[PDB]
Amino acid sequence: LRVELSDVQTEYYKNILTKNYSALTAGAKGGHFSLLNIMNELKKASNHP
DNA sequence: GGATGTATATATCTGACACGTGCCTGGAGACTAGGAAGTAATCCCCTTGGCGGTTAAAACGCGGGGGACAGCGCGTACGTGCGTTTAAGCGGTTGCTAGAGCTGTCTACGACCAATTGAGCGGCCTCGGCACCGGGATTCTCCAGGGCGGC
């Protein structure tokens, strides 16, 4: 069963895939968003925001 | 009526601005070579999120006593003040020598380049020593026969 993505999932996928440290850090002062293992973060974004 | 306090004017001292000059060091223009940026390939280490099992370290609680801290006494050693001494600080002599600066000459020593080759790095074969397996020598436990006692 292939399901489409929500808007939050789509913007998280676009922020990770086109790396946006400033945009990913924005919101409750970040917390040192680690973009090492890009595919791990993409799988996390595909699962749940 | 005489001398004192105060205001304005003039000469002199002093830091700062501009003018002048040398010179030498930085800037402009041109040329060239190589340092570094970029590209592709290969291979190994690091990242993130998990699982499993061992186990020794970490955590928690509790009793107790050793040590930190406060207080007090005391005596000594350091602060304080004064009078006396002494040596630092300044100015000075008198010559000679060391050293910075500048100029000049020259020569041995180090940069540079080409050819060479032999010392450093990797793998391969062998020995020294440690270990695995087979055989000989030495000592320990055991089963059976002979003799004696009882009904």
Swiss-Prot record:
Cellular localisation: Nucleus
Source superkingdom: Eukaryota
Mutant phenotype after disruption: Decreased sensitivity to the cytotoxic effects of 6-azauracil.
Quaternary organization: Component of the 1.8 MDa SAGA complex, which consists of at least of TRA1, CHD1, SPT7, TAF5, ADA3, SGF73, SPT20/ADA5, SPT8, TAF12, TAF6, HFI1/ADA1, UBP8, GCN5, ADA2, SPT3, SGF29, TAF10, TAF9, SGF11 and SUS1. TAF5, TAF6, TAF9, TAF19, TAF12 and ADA1 seem to be present in 2 copies. SAGA is built of 5 distinct domains with specialized functions. Domain I (containing TRA1) probably represents the activator interaction surface.
Further comment: Present with 1620 molecules/cell in log phase SD medium.
Domain notes: The 2 chromodomains are involved in the binding to the histone H3 methyllysine at position 4 (H3K4me3).
Function: ATP-dependent chromatin-remodeling factor which functions as substrate recognition component of the transcription regulatory histone acetylation (HAT) complexes SAGA and SLIK. It recognizes H3K4me. SAGA is involved in RNA polymerase II-dependent transcriptional regulation of approximately 10% of yeast genes. At the promoters, SAGA is required for recruitment of the basal transcription machinery.
Family: Belongs to the SNF2/RAD54 helicase family.
Name by which UniProt lists this protein: Chromo domain-containing protein 1
Native species: Saccharomyces cerevisiae (strain ATCC 204508 / S288c) (Baker's yeast)
